[PDB]
A paper describes a structure:
We report the discovery of a parvovirus with a bipartite genome, Acheta domesticus segmented densovirus (AdSDV), isolated from house crickets (Acheta domesticus), in which it is pathogenic.
The interior of the FC was filled with density attributed to the ssDNA genome. To accommodate the density column, the peak of the FC DE loop moves tangentially away from the channel, which is occupied by large aromatic and hydrophobic sidechains, such as Tyr159 and Ile152. The AdSDV is the first parvovirus, where the “density column”, occupying the fivefold channel of the FC fraction, harbors a direct connection to the ordered N-terminus, confirming that N-terminal externalization is a conserved mechanism and independent from the presence of a functional PLA2. The elongated C-terminal portion of the AdSDV-FC proteins enters the capsid interior from the threefold symmetry axis, connecting to the inner surface throughout the twofold interface. Each subunit interacts with the C-terminal tail of the fivefold neighbor to their twofold neighboring subunit. Five of these are interlinked and interact directly with the capsid surface via π-stacking interactions. The AdSDV FC structure displayed the highest number of ordered nucleotides thus far, which directly interact with the interior capsid surface. This interior-genome interaction, which involves four subunits along with two separate regions of the ssDNA genome, provides additional stability to the otherwise weak interactions at the twofold axis.
Residue numbers in the entry:
A (entry chain A), B (entry chain A): 47 to 101
C (entry chain A): 212 to 376
D (entry chain A): 102 to 376
E (entry chain A): 322 to 376
F (entry chain A): 267 to 321
Amino acid sequence: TKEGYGKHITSMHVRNIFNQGNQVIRNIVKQQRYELLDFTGTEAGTTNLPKIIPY
Amino acid sequence: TKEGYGKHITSMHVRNIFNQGNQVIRNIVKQQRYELLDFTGTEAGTTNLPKIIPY
Amino acid sequence: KEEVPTREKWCHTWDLDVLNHNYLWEPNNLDSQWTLIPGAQAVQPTATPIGPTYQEIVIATKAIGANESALVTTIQDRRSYPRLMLSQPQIKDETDTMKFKYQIRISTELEMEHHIKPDIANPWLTRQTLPLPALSGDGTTRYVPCVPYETHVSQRNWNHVGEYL
Amino acid sequence: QCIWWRGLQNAANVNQTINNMIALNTISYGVRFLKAKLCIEVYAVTRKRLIQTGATSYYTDDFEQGQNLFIGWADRKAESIPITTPADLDETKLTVANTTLFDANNDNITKEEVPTREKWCHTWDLDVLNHNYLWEPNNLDSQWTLIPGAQAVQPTATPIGPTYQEIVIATKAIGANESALVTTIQDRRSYPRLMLSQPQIKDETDTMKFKYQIRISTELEMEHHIKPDIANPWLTRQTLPLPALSGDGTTRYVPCVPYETHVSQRNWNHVGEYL
Amino acid sequence: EMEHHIKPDIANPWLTRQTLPLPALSGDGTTRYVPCVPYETHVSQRNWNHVGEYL
Amino acid sequence: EIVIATKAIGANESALVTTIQDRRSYPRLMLSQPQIKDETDTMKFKYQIRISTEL
DNA sequence: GAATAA
DNA sequence: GAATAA
DNA sequence: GAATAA
DNA sequence: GAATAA
DNA sequence: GAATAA
DNA sequence: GAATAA
């Protein structure tokens, strides 16, 4: 007979404890920025022109 | 009067969107290892002696 | 237009998950500009083709080194991304326009699920990875497309049509 | 991953089920592999007991009913079967060097171990295929030919092609004057690598040597959709060619990718930052 | 019956995204054979029933 | 149990990190064989095992 | 236990 | 999912 | 399926 | 009417 | 949607 | 208000 004593012991079933490559981490990129919009200038991006948000 | 139209717009309350340094990631170090315990040898760790688990 | 006065905020949320059927975008450090937010938008320049990842039905080939390939191939929902701008009122003064300059704080935060690597190498795992809709080309300047709207069309037959059939 | 379900590793392994299959592949415009169920049966687990006095060894084989055949799955690691000849694929003589179900370091194998008088049965559903399509009618004589799957990883040397990726875009000839842009979507099947190995037990000299008496039992459900009652060369529209490797390469590595990770379309919950 | 989806109120050459060209034959051929395939066979995603072999 | 330590934080600052924590006796753990006297000393056992340690 | 404690 | 989808 | 989907 | 009788 | 899908 | 009145 194959028998033995132990604690937190069990007949051995399938164990592969590596995930099958499924895991998800979640960060939020957080980029608060104080900015200025200057239309008072003649230079490049400072003009009467609409300033763009390139989402 | 200070008023303007918008969508998903609100009177501006306190916003600092950086966490106050509280965040928790959880990995499990996973280290399955097939090993041998050899007491049949005369060399170093192979002997009659109990082999140790240094948790 | 959406106009914000002082002590009012313009908040707008985009859902950048365009993507169906157990796929992902390649892992990317965003250092690269001319690189676009997830979208199925269909309009690419001839000069800097964005490629299949950019069209709704993606058909692409990822290398996986020399010896292998992955015909990563998905369908995804189409996202028209209009153009967005921050401009002033146009008010003719005695001389041209009045000039406005806004003190603002933009606040831009971006949710991402970074699906981390397997516990064991799978170069063949790129199957469900897609490259971003990055513009590819030698062009120093690149025009990133904004198409305002995706029109709704019907699969429905007619109603209140006078001709009897 | 390959198709040995015809039992190619020896031409001696043909039964009318194969013959029935061939006659159906003749009268059929297209086919689907609906289900594939494999059952291993272990009649014996037999190690070679090596009794060694110095400078001599006595050999005898002895039954171990306390040991069992390990059916390994490589679910953590990207691996390939090299395939060359229909014989090169055999449940027995087929191997890859420096491969062990037991690594001293990271054991990457999910094992299913069968003792004597226990069987390993595993079923694969080979219907990957949606939207009223089929695989071409095929006599499986051709190795380097793969079971239905949307698996996305093909070699550069022997591209499997669109049929192998999830969204199929291919051109079937229909002779010279016509073509069919057979074009479907199908669900992705990661097919890991499967192995039959022994326990690795260091003896005084290297490993103990085990040899298993077993009966593999491999049966494969197929709906052979038979031909129209009238010629339609243009009917290949809903037929696809198999994920067969194409190339001049004598040896071809058939890919096994362990798993298809699950990702969410769901937004977050219990995220502390308020938004 | 045709729903002619009329143009935007503003030019969108980039709107062809959801437009497709017809299945027009392209070629120099003066005579062109337009294909007619009688039927799309129904195949099952269903497993079997009343199969005698037990499995 | 009661931690009193000084973390540097560079030269200009310090932290008298100072906590209480519950006491953990960690015994010694061993993997050994039965001791069975044979005609010559002990029987020699060698175990094929897979340790699996995840943290 | 707007400042991320799953 | 009279034009064969057990 | 204020940005025209009868 | 695990050995295939829709 | 034992192989980590918060 | 099969001959198109949303």
